[PDB]
Amino acid sequence: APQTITELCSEYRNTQIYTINDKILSYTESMAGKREMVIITFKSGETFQVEVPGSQHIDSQKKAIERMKDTLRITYLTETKIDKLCVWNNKTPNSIAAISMKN
Amino acid sequence: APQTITELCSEYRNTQIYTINDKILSYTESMAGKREMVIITFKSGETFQVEVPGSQHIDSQKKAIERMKDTLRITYLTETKIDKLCVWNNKTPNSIAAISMKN
Amino acid sequence: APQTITELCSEYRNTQIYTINDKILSYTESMAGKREMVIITFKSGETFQVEVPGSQHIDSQKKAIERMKDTLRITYLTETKIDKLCVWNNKTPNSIAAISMKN
Amino acid sequence: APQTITELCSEYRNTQIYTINDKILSYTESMAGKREMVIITFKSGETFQVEVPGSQHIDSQKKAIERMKDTLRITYLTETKIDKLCVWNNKTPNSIAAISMKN
Amino acid sequence: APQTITELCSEYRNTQIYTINDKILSYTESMAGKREMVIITFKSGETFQVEVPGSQHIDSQKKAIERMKDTLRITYLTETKIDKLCVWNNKTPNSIAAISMKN
Numbered sequence: 478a479p480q481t482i483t484e485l486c487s488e489y490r491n492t493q494i495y496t497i498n499d500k501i502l503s504y505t506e507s508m509a510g511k512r513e514m515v516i517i518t519f520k521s522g523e524t525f526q527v528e529v530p531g532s533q534h535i536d537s538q539k540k541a542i543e544r545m546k547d548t549l550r551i552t553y554l555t556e557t558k559i560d561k562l563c564v565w566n567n568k569t570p571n572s573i574a575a576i577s578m579k580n
Numbered sequence: 581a582p583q584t585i586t587e588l589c590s591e592y593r594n595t596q597i598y599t600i601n602d603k604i605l606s607y608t609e610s611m612a613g614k615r616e617m618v619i620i621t622f623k624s625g626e627t628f629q630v631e632v633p634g635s636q637h638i639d640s641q642k643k644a645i646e647r648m649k650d651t652l653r654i655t656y657l658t659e660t661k662i663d664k665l666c667v668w669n670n671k672t673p674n675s676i677a678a679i680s681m682k683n
Numbered sequence: 684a685p686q687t688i689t690e691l692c693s694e695y696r697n698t699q700i701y702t703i704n705d706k707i708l709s710y711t712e713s714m715a716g717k718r719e720m721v722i723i724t725f726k727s728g729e730t731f732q733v734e735v736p737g738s739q740h741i742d743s744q745k746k747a748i749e750r751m752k753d754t755l756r757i758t759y760l761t762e763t764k765i766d767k768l769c770v771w772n773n774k775t776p777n778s779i780a781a782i783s784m785k786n
Numbered sequence: 787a788p789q790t791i792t793e794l795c796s797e798y799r800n801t802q803i804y805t806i807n808d809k810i811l812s813y814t815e816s817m818a819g820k821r822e823m824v825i826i827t828f829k830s831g832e833t834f835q836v837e838v839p840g841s842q843h844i845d846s847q848k849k850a851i852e853r854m855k856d857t858l859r860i861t862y863l864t865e866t867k868i869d870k871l872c873v874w875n876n877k878t879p880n881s882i883a884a885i886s887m888k889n
Numbered sequence: 890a891p892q893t894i895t896e897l898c899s900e901y902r903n904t905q906i907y908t909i910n911d912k913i914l915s916y917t918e919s920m921a922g923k924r925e926m927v928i929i930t931f932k933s934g935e936t937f938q939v940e941v942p943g944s945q946h947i948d949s950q951k952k953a954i955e956r957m958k959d960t961l962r963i964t965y966l967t968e969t970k971i972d973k974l975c976v977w978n979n980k981t982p983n984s985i986a987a988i989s990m991k992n
């Protein structure tokens with residue numbers, strides 16, 4: 478298994494590490510049908526999503542998708558600095574694969 | 581996928597953006613049969629619901645409805661300022677589709 | 684849909700509004716078989732339960748029962764003032780149908 | 787339904803009330819197979835478990851077991867004083883049936 | 890049942906106690922397919938994982954794996970000092986079996 482977010486991110490195609498080093502500026506959550514998703518933005522202007530669950534996801538990802546949304550909300554609310562995001566860059570906005578935080 | 585709440589809200593009919601820019605004044609939660617719902621009010625006087633799950637909801641929305649209720653409670657309790665709500669205006673009170681918070 | 688706890692509470696029989704305006708004094712939680720329930724008391728001496736799930740509950744209430752117990756715990760722990768409780772008065776102690784909090 | 791932890795505890799065999807009146811000293815959580823359990827200790831030296839789910843549990847207890855572990859963690863982390871524990875004394879360490887907290 | 894993390898850890902093969910006595914330095918969470926996992930590091934330079942769920946896990950562990958990831962996040966966020974980790978040493982990085990915290 479990978480030992481860092483960067484190492485994990487390299488195990489995939491169409492991914493890149495964004496070094497954020499900042500707390501989340503805005504949190505957006507939708508329960509509208511077909512748009513069950515979370516959107517986060519930063520001071521940098523960069524916007525990121527957790528995608529709507531769909532056929533691009535395998536079973537093992539369903540709970541992890543829910544976990545990521547849980548993490549984004551509590552990260553937002555505690556003003557916790559996110560270190561890095563591993564994101565897929567074939568989606569608009571870029572889609573969150575992994576998150577890291579340092580303290 | 582949409583990049584902001586406003587953009588997401590535009591992908592639906594009978595929706596409008598309320599710019600709230602305030603913490604939640606009151607939180608009401610019900611486990612009474614056929615009224616399994618949350619109601620939030622603001623200082624502005626405006627009241628909003630998360631609807632009882634029903635036939636107007638698709639399967640993908642069940643977990644998101646529960647998420648929205650989770651978010652409203654923790655938002656309330658932390659006195660977090662809500663920025664915008666995307667709501668359906670063909671329900672009374674208006675029904676929450678999406679929420680945003682800025683920091 | 685109702686716009687306030689009081690309005691919601693009036694849609695049912697054997698219910699009444701208790702104006703609490705206080706934080707929870709004691710929180711009791713049981714995982715003993717047939718007594719999977721939460722009990723709360725106040726400084727006023729009044730005691731309230733979330734009933735054990737049973738045949739008086741419809742399916743849509745299962746998740747809401749669990750939510751109400753979640754809310755009672757976090758409310759207790761944060762010393763959050765409860766405003767009102769809608770309770771069923773044909774149970775001993777009185778059984779929680781809805782809760783409100785103002786800030 | 788019972789109105790206090792003590793009253794609830796008396797509806798069972800092999801149970802006793804421990805008056806703790808203290809915050810949790812240590813929290814131990816295991817995800818090892820056949821040892822999916824939580825252990826808590828106190829300054830008094832007394833140790834308590836939430837048992838591994840097994841055939842001694844009825845269906846209605848599955849969620850309540852998970853709730854009890856949730857409560858123990860958040861209680862530990864907030865340094866919340868536990869008042870009383872209703873425990874089964876036919877297990878080693880004694881097994882948690884109910885918990886109460888006063889404020 | 891075991892009464893301490895050390896005692897529990899001894900009921901398994903390929904395990905060892907790491908005495909950490911420190912808060913978590915970094916928290917990494919991934920929802921990428923086949924890498925649904927959490928990684929934590931410490932100031933000591935030691936890295937640990939909660940493994941991706943797979944055939945090495947029995948059914949009773951599914952909920953416990955999710956709980957462990959919940960605990961790591963909230964532990965990280967509250968800067969709570971971990972005391973000990975029971976870890977499997979036949980995985981890279983070492984894989985978390987149990988955790989303890991003292992206060």
Ligand SMILES: CC(=O)N[C@H]1[C@H](O[C@@H]2[C@H](O[C@]3(C(=O)O)C[C@H](O)[C@@H](NC(C)=O)[C@H]([C@H](O)[C@H](O)CO)O3)[C@@H](O)[C@H](O[C@H]3[C@H](O)[C@@H](O)[C@H](O)O[C@@H]3CO)O[C@@H]2CO)O[C@H](CO)[C@H](O)[C@@H]1O[C@@H]1O[C@H](CO)[C@H](O)[C@H](O)[C@H]1O
Pocket residue numbers: 488489490491528532533534535538565566567568572921922923924
């Ligand atoms: C790049 C891509 O299409 N990914 C989609 C994936 O396709 C699989 C293979 O992609 C990789 C990858 O994601 O980069 C290759 C990695 O080595 C794998 N990494 C690890 C650590 O296992 C991952 C991983 O297995 C999956 O992501 C987990 O589900 O997959 C890709 O190389 C392979 O391509 C085949 C192709 O299918 C076939 O038509 C052609 O004949 O040959 C190609 C070259 O071999 O296909 C793999 C699956 O068959 O498939 C998943 C569903 O399994 C998704 O569709 C994924 O798309 C991304 O999904 C993300 C969410 O998980 C997110 O939405 C991204 O935006 C999507 O692009």
Ligand SMILES: CC(=O)N[C@H]1[C@H](O[C@@H]2[C@H](O[C@]3(C(=O)O)C[C@H](O)[C@@H](NC(C)=O)[C@H]([C@H](O)[C@H](O)CO)O3)[C@@H](O)[C@H](O[C@H]3[C@H](O)[C@@H](O)[C@H](O)O[C@@H]3CO)O[C@@H]2CO)O[C@H](CO)[C@H](O)[C@@H]1O[C@@H]1O[C@H](CO)[C@H](O)[C@H](O)[C@H]1O
Pocket residue numbers: 509510511512591592593594631635636637638641668669670671675
């Ligand atoms: C307006 C309406 O009745 N919406 C109900 C919806 O109906 C479907 C179509 O809905 C839209 C919409 O809701 O605005 C159109 C959007 O482009 C869609 N957006 C996206 C991003 O896909 C949404 C979305 O797919 C759904 O909301 C997700 O469930 O749907 C609606 O336009 C369509 O109307 C047809 C009509 O049926 C047909 O006779 C006629 O010839 O063509 C019309 C369009 O040209 O019907 C669609 C259903 O097949 O359906 C959902 C559940 O399926 C809801 O019932 C929705 O009502 C709202 O539900 C909300 C909660 O999700 C909330 O309760 C609101 O108050 C409800 O009005």
Ligand SMILES: CC(=O)N[C@H]1[C@H](O[C@@H]2[C@H](O[C@]3(C(=O)O)C[C@H](O)[C@@H](NC(C)=O)[C@H]([C@H](O)[C@H](O)CO)O3)[C@@H](O)[C@H](O[C@H]3[C@H](O)[C@@H](O)[C@H](O)O[C@@H]3CO)O[C@@H]2CO)O[C@H](CO)[C@H](O)[C@@H]1O[C@@H]1O[C@H](CO)[C@H](O)[C@H](O)[C@H]1O
Pocket residue numbers: 612613614615694695696697734738739740741771772773774778
């Ligand atoms: C009062 C009562 O007995 N409630 C039980 C309920 O019975 C149903 C009807 O009750 C009402 C009510 O609770 O006030 C009537 C309301 O208008 C309804 N309000 C709304 C917004 O929907 C509610 C609501 O539907 C339910 O609470 C949700 O399940 O129900 C009751 O009037 C009706 O009695 C009829 C009977 O059906 C008929 O055959 C007889 O001959 O005459 C009566 C009078 O016309 O029966 C309804 C059910 O068929 O049913 C639910 C289960 O669905 C429960 O059993 C409920 O008991 C309460 O449950 C609470 C928690 O949910 C709590 O434990 C209380 O202590 C219980 O009394």
Ligand SMILES: CC(=O)N[C@H]1[C@H](O[C@@H]2[C@H](O[C@]3(C(=O)O)C[C@H](O)[C@@H](NC(C)=O)[C@H]([C@H](O)[C@H](O)CO)O3)[C@@H](O)[C@H](O[C@H]3[C@H](O)[C@@H](O)[C@H](O)O[C@@H]3CO)O[C@@H]2CO)O[C@H](CO)[C@H](O)[C@@H]1O[C@@H]1O[C@H](CO)[C@H](O)[C@H](O)[C@H]1O
Pocket residue numbers: 715716717718797798799800837841842843844874876877881
């Ligand atoms: C004491 C005991 O062995 N309990 C096990 C239980 O057995 C049932 C009866 O237990 C009581 C009890 O716990 O004291 C009696 C109480 O009045 C009941 N209280 C309420 C509110 O219902 C409880 C309760 O029903 C259950 O605990 C909920 O699951 O049960 C016990 O009296 C009865 O014993 C019979 C025996 O079966 C029969 O052969 C003999 O002829 O007469 C005896 C006296 O009537 O059996 C009852 C069920 O068959 O069953 C549960 C699960 O079904 C557990 O096995 C329980 O063991 C405890 O489980 C705890 C966790 O829930 C914990 O791990 C303890 O360490 C276990 O002892």
Ligand SMILES: CC(=O)N[C@H]1[C@H](O[C@@H]2[C@H](O[C@]3(C(=O)O)C[C@H](O)[C@@H](NC(C)=O)[C@H]([C@H](O)[C@H](O)CO)O3)[C@@H](O)[C@H](O[C@H]3[C@H](O)[C@@H](O)[C@H](O)O[C@@H]3CO)O[C@@H]2CO)O[C@H](CO)[C@H](O)[C@@H]1O[C@@H]1O[C@H](CO)[C@H](O)[C@H](O)[C@H]1O
Pocket residue numbers: 818819820821900901902903940944945946947977979980984
């Ligand atoms: C060492 C190993 O490979 N363990 C895998 C396990 O194998 C079972 C036995 O493992 C023990 C153990 O892990 O120490 C023995 C303990 O006494 C048990 N402890 C308790 C408290 O009950 C545990 C426990 O029951 C399991 O973890 C339950 O999930 O298991 C192992 O001794 C036994 O090996 C046999 C072999 O099968 C047989 O061919 C040969 O003739 O004799 C051997 C030695 O007597 O096999 C047992 C299974 O039948 O199986 C589990 C899944 O059931 C895992 O695969 C486990 O591998 C580890 O899994 C961990 C996560 O759970 C982690 O990822 C580690 O990295 C894996 O090594």
